[PDB]
Amino acid sequence: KRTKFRKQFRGRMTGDAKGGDYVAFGDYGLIAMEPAWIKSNQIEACRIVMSRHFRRGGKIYIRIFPDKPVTKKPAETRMGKGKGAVEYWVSVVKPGRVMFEVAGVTEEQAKEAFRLAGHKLPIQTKMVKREVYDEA
């Protein structure tokens, strides 16, 4: 969720992601296919769904993180003073980027958990078990 950090506001455009195409932690991983912002409560709902389905057990990693501030001008004004101070934090997400990955849960239950979590994300997404991997 919200970071405790630095400059309030930013900008925006896109290109395919590089910083995490492969599933390092855990066994399985759901993975993004579209370039939307993800932001805060969207993730946290993914987290709370999977933690319901799995917890008492399993290991849940959230490799994505609401870095990027996004702004809302007030109410109903004209293009006025500056931008709007707050609103929500997002994480940009490009295809092949891994958002989620379970540990210690059978293949089928990871299927169902990824299905639930992905039914509330702006992007469609595909899951995979980790092929052979390199990058260490």
Q: Which of 4, 124, 131, 132 binds RNA (CB under 7 A)?
A: 4
Which stretches does DSSP call E strand in 1-136?
28-32, 59-62, 68-71, 87-90, 100-103, 125-129
**The residue count for the chain:** 136
Stretch that binds RNA, among 41-49, 82-90, 108-116, 118-126 (CB under 7 A): 82-90
Determine, following the binding rule CB under 5 A, whether residue 8 of this chain makes contact with Mg ion: no
> Which pair of tokens denotes residue 102?
């379970």
Q: Is 14 in the site for Mg ion (CB under 5 A)?
A: yes
Sole binder of Mg ion in the list 7, 15, 56, 77 (CB under 5 A): 15
Place of tokens 């994300």: 121
**What residues between 86 and 125 interact with RNA by CB under 7 A?**
92
